[PDB]
Ligand binder design. Sequence first.
Ligand SMILES: *[C@@H]1O[C@H](CO)[C@@H](O[C@@H]2O[C@H](CO)[C@@H](O)[C@H](O)[C@H]2NC(C)=O)[C@H](O)[C@H]1NC(C)=O
Ligand SMILES: *[C@@H]1O[C@H](CO)[C@@H](O[C@@H]2O[C@H](CO)[C@@H](O)[C@H](O)[C@H]2NC(C)=O)[C@H](O)[C@H]1NC(C)=O
Lengths: 49, 262, 52, 49
Amino acid sequence: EYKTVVPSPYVKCCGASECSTKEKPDYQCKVYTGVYPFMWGGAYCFCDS
Amino acid sequence: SVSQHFNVYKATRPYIAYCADCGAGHSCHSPVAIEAVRSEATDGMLKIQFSAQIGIDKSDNHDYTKIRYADGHAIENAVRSSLKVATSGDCFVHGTMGHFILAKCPPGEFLQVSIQDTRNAVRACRIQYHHDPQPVGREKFTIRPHYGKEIPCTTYQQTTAKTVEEIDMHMPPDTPDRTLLSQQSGNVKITVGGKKVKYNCTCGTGNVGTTNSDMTINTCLIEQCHVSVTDHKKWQFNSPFVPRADEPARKGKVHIPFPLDN
Amino acid sequence: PPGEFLQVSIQDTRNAVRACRIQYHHDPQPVGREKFTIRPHYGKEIPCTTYQ
Amino acid sequence: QPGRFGDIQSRTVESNDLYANTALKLARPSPGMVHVPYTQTPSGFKYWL
Ligand SMILES: *[C@@H]1O[C@H](CO)[C@@H](O[C@@H]2O[C@H](CO)[C@@H](O)[C@H](O)[C@H]2NC(C)=O)[C@H](O)[C@H]1NC(C)=O
Ligand SMILES: *[C@@H]1O[C@H](CO)[C@@H](O[C@@H]2O[C@H](CO)[C@@H](O)[C@H](O)[C@H]2NC(C)=O)[C@H](O)[C@H]1NC(C)=O
C-alpha cells in the first residue's frame, strides 16, 4: 500500500513564488495566484489579490 | 519509565484546524480536528489522530486523567472521562497516548470524536470512514468462542516505547488576531497581553515593525492596521489545514506509539 | 439517522419518563448525484431547501 | 498502471527506489480557505486484495 505525503501549504502575501522539480515519486507541484486565506482570528495578509 | 516516555511531548503544543462538519452540519474551527485513520490491524483496532493531546497537562507535566487542547492562544485542560468515539453506536477505547487514540468500533459509515470543554461545552468533529472489519479466517463471526482454533492475527500493542515509524513537526506560523485592536477617538491602540506582536499600517510612514509592549498609533482608522502574534517557541504538527511558516526546513521528528505485532 | 420508528420523551415532575413512539420510515437522500453521509471540505454548491 | 495491481513498485523490500504511477492531480483551493485538495485513484493493492 502507498501513502500520499502532503505538507502544509506555503502562502506568501504581496509577492510570488515558483517551485522546482525534484527527484521524488510522482511529484506534483503547482502555484496558484490570487488567494485570500482566512484563519480563526481574521484575514491572513493585507494584499487582496 | 512511563513518565520518562513523555520527554518528547515537552516541546509541542496542540493546534486548531478546519474540519468540515463539527456536529450539526456547520463548518467550524475546532481543536478536535481529525487528520488520519489507520486500520492496518487485522483484528480491527482503529488508530485515530487528532489535534488535542492526551496525557499532558497545561503546565507540561505527565498526568493520565487530563487532556490538553488549544483555545485562542492559550492551552486549557479537560477531564479524560469526557472522551467519546462513536460510529453508529458507542464504541470502546483500548488505549490513548498523546496525539493518538486506539478504539474498536461497530460497523458504520461515519466516525465522531468528542471532548468536553471547561465550560461543559461539547466539541466534536465527524468525518466519513467506511468501516467494516472481516475477522481473520474463513468464518465471519462476531464474538469469540469458548472452544475454537488459534490462528495468527495481528494487532496494535499498547507499549509506549520508541518505534521506528515517526511523524514530523515544524514551527507554527503567525496567527492573526483582530481583538488586540482598540479605537480611541482618532487613534488605534494595540494591547500586547504578554505576547510579541507584529504590525503593518499604511497610514503615515514607517509604521512597520515588531514590538512587545502597548503602544498607540495616531491618525489611523481601526481598519487600516493588521497584527499577528509571532513568538511561537513551541512546535506544531505539519498539517495541510494550517499554513506553513517562512522556513521550508524540517525542524523536528516525533515518534508515534503503538507499533504492530503478531 | 435512518430508521423505521421515531420517539419523543420528556421527564415528569416526579422524575418519571414520559415517551410516545410512532412508526415513520425515514431514509434521507442527499441532493445531487451522489449518496454521501458527511459533508466534504472541497466540492460544489447545489441549491437546496431547508427549514429556517 | 494506476488503480490496478502494480501501481507502486520496488525491486526489494530494503531498496530505496520506487516507481509510482497513481495519477496525483492537484486542484485550486476553495476561496477563503487554507487547504490543499487532490484527486488520486485508490490503491490497486486493495483492489487486488
Ligand atoms: C505592508 O502592507 C503594504 C500594503 O498596505 C505592503 O505594500 C505592498 O508592497 C508590495 C511589494 O512589497 C507592492 O507590490 C504593493 O503595491 C504594496 N501595496 C501598497 C498598498 O502600497 C507592504 O509590503 C507590507 N509590508 C510588510 C512588511 O508586510
Ligand atoms: C509476526 O511474526 C512473523 C513470523 O515470525 C513475522 O514475519 C517475519 O518477520 C521477520 C522479521 O522479524 C522477517 O525476517 C520474516 O521474513 C517474516 N516472515 C516472512 C514469512 O516473511 C512478522 O513480521 C511479525 N509481525 C510483526 C508486526 O513484526
